[PDB]
Amino acid sequence: AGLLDGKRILVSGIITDSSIAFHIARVAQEQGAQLVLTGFDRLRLIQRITDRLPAKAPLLELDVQNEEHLASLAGRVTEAIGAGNKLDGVVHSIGFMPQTGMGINPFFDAPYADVSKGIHISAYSYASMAKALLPIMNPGGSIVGMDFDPSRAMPAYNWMTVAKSALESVNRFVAREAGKYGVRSNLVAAGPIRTLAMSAIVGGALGEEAGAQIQLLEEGWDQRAPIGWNMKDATPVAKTVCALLSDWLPATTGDIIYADGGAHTQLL
Amino acid sequence: AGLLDGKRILVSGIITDSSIAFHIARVAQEQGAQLVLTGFDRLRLIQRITDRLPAKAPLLELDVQNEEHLASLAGRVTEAIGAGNKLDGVVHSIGFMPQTGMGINPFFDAPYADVSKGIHISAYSYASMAKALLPIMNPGGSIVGMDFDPSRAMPAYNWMTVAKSALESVNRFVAREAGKYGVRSNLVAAGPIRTLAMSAIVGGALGEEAGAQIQLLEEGWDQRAPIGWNMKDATPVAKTVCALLSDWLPATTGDIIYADGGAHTQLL
Amino acid sequence: AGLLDGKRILVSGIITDSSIAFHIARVAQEQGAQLVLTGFDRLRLIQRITDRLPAKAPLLELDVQNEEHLASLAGRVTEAIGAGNKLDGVVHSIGFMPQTGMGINPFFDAPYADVSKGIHISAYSYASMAKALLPIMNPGGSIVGMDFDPSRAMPAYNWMTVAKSALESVNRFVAREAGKYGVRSNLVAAGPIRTLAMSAIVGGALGEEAGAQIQLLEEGWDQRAPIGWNMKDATPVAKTVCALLSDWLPATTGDIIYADGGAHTQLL
Amino acid sequence: AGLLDGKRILVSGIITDSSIAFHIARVAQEQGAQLVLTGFDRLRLIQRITDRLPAKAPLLELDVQNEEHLASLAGRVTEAIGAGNKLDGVVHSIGFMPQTGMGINPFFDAPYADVSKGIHISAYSYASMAKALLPIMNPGGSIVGMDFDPSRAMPAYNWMTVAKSALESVNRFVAREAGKYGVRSNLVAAGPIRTLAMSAIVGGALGEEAGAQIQLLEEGWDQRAPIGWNMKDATPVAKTVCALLSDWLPATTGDIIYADGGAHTQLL
Ligand SMILES: CCCc1cc(C(=O)[C@H]2C=CN([C@@H]3O[C@H](COP(=O)(O)OP(=O)(O)OC[C@H]4O[C@@H](n5cnc6c(N)ncnc65)[C@H](O)[C@@H]4O)[C@@H](O)[C@H]3O)C=C2C(N)=O)ccn1
Ligand SMILES: CCCc1cc(C(=O)[C@H]2C=CN([C@@H]3O[C@H](COP(=O)(O)OP(=O)(O)OC[C@H]4O[C@@H](n5cnc6c(N)ncnc65)[C@H](O)[C@@H]4O)[C@@H](O)[C@H]3O)C=C2C(N)=O)ccn1
Numbered sequence A, B, C, D: 001a002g003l004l005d006g007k008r009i010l011v012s013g014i015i016t017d018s019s020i021a022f023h024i025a026r027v028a029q030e031q032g033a034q035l036v037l038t039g040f041d042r043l044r045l046i047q048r049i050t051d052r053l054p055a056k057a058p059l060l061e062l063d064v065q066n067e068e069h070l071a072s073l074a075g076r077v078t079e080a081i082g083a084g085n086k087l088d089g090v091v092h093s094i095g096f097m098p099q100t101g102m103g104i105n106p107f108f109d110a111p112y113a114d115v116s117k118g119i120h121i122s123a124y125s126y127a128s129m130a131k132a133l134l135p136i137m138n139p140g141g142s143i144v145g146m147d148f149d150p151s152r153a154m155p156a157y158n159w160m161t162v163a164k165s166a167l168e169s170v171n172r173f174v175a176r177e178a179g180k181y182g183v184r185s186n187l188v189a190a191g192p193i194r195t196l197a198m199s200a201i202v203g204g205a206l207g208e209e210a211g212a213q214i215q216l217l218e219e220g221w222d223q224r225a226p227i228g229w230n231m232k233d234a235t236p237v238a239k240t241v242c243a244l245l246s247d248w249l250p251a252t253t254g255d256i257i258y259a260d261g262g263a264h265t266q267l268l
């Protein structure tokens, strides 16, 4: 009734109540969307997280590394939303790099099989999902994934940054494909957010010293950002994903909206 | 009922029914916004043009080069909206480069007095409007200005491109100020759009090679644009401006949204 | 007498007399550099090809996907240059994407095992060579890898473009490591160059539309390039690589130099 | 005899012995260049600074704001270097923004006439000098100006940043012109350097508190930079300008080499 009114949207990436995907979905439903959810290997767990949302939604299994799951995803989605119905939107909210790729180990010690899995889940799957779901999206429709700005190097995030860089590259090619169906493809670049994955990634670890470093991030980002940033509130990010899912950005595709308080636009 | 319900927005830059400001305004009103309009020097023209908008809005004189128009702008707006009310939106849609600064006249032959005036009108004025209107805007407010991608050089557009490069820089500073009031400041980079002036120009009003170069760019644009581009429909651009004026992009500032068909993301 | 007098540099990636590595090497020797060469799998080929260089240089086997070749690389180089000597330069000029990842095969149809191998060879390997050779490089040393601008998507190049996006990211991390040894790490973004493989490809070895798309890009390139571009002369590119290997760009790292005719700076 | 050997180069922008232009010139002469110098209104003063260089060089007056000076510059340069001789290189090392545009006053309080002069001297003059000197440059030749990265906002530099943004835009157009003469146009982006202009600009002021802020800059940049940065040494910057003046970057034009220790490539 208020933004995503009448729209049918698939949302992946819910693992905890802190998941950004969790907040995408809540906000999406507040704005009137019928959701299909997608989840990984704790189906038990996430189903329990899922019923805490404002409305009911089918929950499907998707191992983005599983060629079978992907191959049947369009069919399983259709049974959930009704034959003769298509999707209007798709949220890719998936990330993974093994620890060996992240603040722990030095950059050079991440083995390639590890980095490869990371890139598989974090960049490539954005294309898989497009391949799988694009055949059942409506014209006017929207695909959006979650990104962070990898344009400069930083401590800790290491191969996850590399993976995001690739993600941004994949998104411009996906958009050429999506364009044939009248569908947009975009990334949202968030500033940092205190999801359980984040507070875990690092700090812990590197180093150990700190979940006070998590606090320092939060304070520093809020400083850099002209309109401030609150790392504990995923709502501003979720509002941005929702705008891309609406009809209000009808001419933007293959890019990156930054929902980061404007921090990327300031040197300090 | 809509995107922009209850919002008090000032729109500048309407000169004819084909000005992009004209369609920003049309869309804003359809979306529940109450407007104040600003026009430059043909007020009788702007009066008859703006009478065709879906709802009546007061019209104020503002030459952006006029120190006194700026000094009085806040007062004059407050009169118009009711003392004790403030603006939720400002739209800067003003641009000009003298004839020596565009088209056939060689890049090197633009006199600095011409360049200076162009940058005055085209870049700096985004600061001055910011300075005048922020003392009367509400937190959560939005300032949006019109841009086009100047990261690469091109034929015909010449000093106007330089003007836009500066504007993108100005916008980043204005965001730091607007932050202090809880106000965002962003630009929309449009694709080429067929206004009166652009048509005359492609018609060869600034020489024929300038005209033919621009028509090439226009054709190339739509080809590259993964979702195509329609240079004769300013609506997709107006909707993007409204997206920024709304509460649904609350964490973007100092930034540029590309309402351009995805074109800047494709080499070819 | 010249640019690179007394410098001990390792060059990889020579496969034929038209490999850009081949001309990097030719130019380096003309400029006083003493080389060690690395070749991948047709060593007898690389032997007869590299015998035509202005001076003899030892040739070492290195499959970048081979864990053992990397483990032994530092030892094998030291043998070759004399124990107690170190490298002043490393040139990474290696790239590969399987057939499913380029050309006519649809973007979406590349299997991840093909993409993974491409990124292995094309992006990650820049890390591993860095890891192997930095323990044996001198302060003031220079690592340079071969790139092309992937900031925008394009036809035919597909996953290879993604690979390069990742490489630019990797290069930024490698710079942080190379810093600790007083070593710079930069990439050179070349214009398109007519190697054996590129000619076969423009000849339609990966389908004809891929070929014709690439020839378009090549023509467009030279038109845009303010100083023109000659796709058949890899020398300007080799000189740029040498510029980075020299002491005359001592304060650039984590960075990309565009040896491309100025083309990426012009929309048209 | 060693890099700029045989090359005739104009260098503008010498005001104190701390001037970057001062170090450009010294290094240029160390590498074998015959220089023409250009200076502003303290001809007395700078002549005295000038004789402290390694060799003798004609010194000419150039008020870049003076249309007369510019109009006769090519003629005055020819008499200094010999009829039938052309230049191979041009260093634009000129900057100016009035204080009202810099850390003192708030961003919005800089009047346009002030910002305009700033833009005139800092951006536009780069084109003037090209217009003036391009008719007497050799093919293969090089124009280079000094820039700093304006891509994000920062405290203090305010309208000087805006001016640099415009500078970068002007440089891509200059390159289209220069290209017709076989001449390259590029910018060097330096990290910060303790020239007398810098330590004065700001700190003093804003604020007052500190020339300890100058110290803090220096420490922080050296941190961000993978290879470190020493704000007291202009030699690394001067080496980079010299590389662009050489034949070793023959395919780069309309861009920006960063001589900033790699700081722009790291988020921290
Ligand atoms: C500090 C400077 C570095 C930088 C980094 C950041 C961030 O990393 C921001 C920026 C972007 N994000 C993105 O949101 C997305 C959601 O993350 P997030 O919500 O933060 O964490 P998670 O809740 O744990 O979500 C990950 C999901 O993935 C799914 N997953 C994982 N593997 C499997 C496979 N094999 N099968 C099926 N499903 C899989 C997993 O099950 C989860 O559902 C993700 O893409 C993040 O990269 C999340 C961030 C954060 N701070 O939490 C912003 C600014 N700067
Ligand atoms: C091809 C590569 C470059 C290219 C260029 C383009 C464009 O130029 C696009 C993208 C951005 N724009 C911007 O929209 C804005 C609206 O213009 P636009 O709506 O395009 O044209 P106009 O209708 O004629 O409006 C100009 C307005 O300005 C006003 N103005 C003039 N002087 C005065 C002063 N002294 N005081 C106050 N107001 C001033 C004037 O009266 C007009 O209302 C403007 O900033 C444009 O630069 C206009 C576009 C166009 N196609 O008409 C997009 C993609 N790429």
Ligand SMILES: CCCc1cc(C(=O)[C@H]2C=CN([C@@H]3O[C@H](COP(=O)(O)OP(=O)(O)OC[C@H]4O[C@@H](n5cnc6c(N)ncnc65)[C@H](O)[C@@H]4O)[C@@H](O)[C@H]3O)C=C2C(N)=O)ccn1
Pocket: B267, C012, C013, C014, C015, C016, C018, C019, C020, C021, C039, C040, C041, C062, C063, C064, C065, C093, C094, C095, C096, C121, C146, C147, C148, C149, C154, C157, C189, C190, C191, C192, C193, C194, C195, C197, C198, C217, C218
């Ligand atoms: C048009 C838009 C995109 C476009 C593309 C281009 C280009 O693709 C340019 C710009 C960059 N390059 C890069 O130079 C590099 C040299 O290639 P290049 O010299 O172009 O081709 P090759 O001679 O065939 O070399 C490939 C080498 O790799 C080696 N290789 C292969 N596998 C192995 C493994 N397993 N171990 C060790 N070595 C490996 C292989 O044997 C070869 O020696 C390479 O990175 C290219 O990607 C090559 C160019 C080209 N025209 O040939 C520039 C501008 N734009």
Ligand SMILES: CCCc1cc(C(=O)[C@H]2C=CN([C@@H]3O[C@H](COP(=O)(O)OP(=O)(O)OC[C@H]4O[C@@H](n5cnc6c(N)ncnc65)[C@H](O)[C@@H]4O)[C@@H](O)[C@H]3O)C=C2C(N)=O)ccn1
Pocket: D012, D013, D014, D015, D016, D018, D019, D020, D021, D039, D040, D041, D062, D063, D064, D065, D093, D094, D095, D096, D121, D146, D147, D148, D149, D154, D157, D189, D190, D191, D192, D193, D194, D195, D196, D197, D198, D217
């Ligand atoms: C802290 C983050 C902000 C940012 C800023 C910086 C910098 O500002 C660096 C980056 C670039 N520069 C550039 O070098 C150039 C030389 O400056 P610099 O050498 O720093 O100062 P000056 O010695 O005083 O040089 C200015 C010259 O100009 C000439 N000038 C002035 N007006 C007149 C007119 N009317 N007529 C004729 N001549 C004129 C003036 O006479 C001087 O000769 C200049 O363009 C700087 O902008 C000098 C910097 C510095 N730190 O000293 C790098 C990284 N980040």
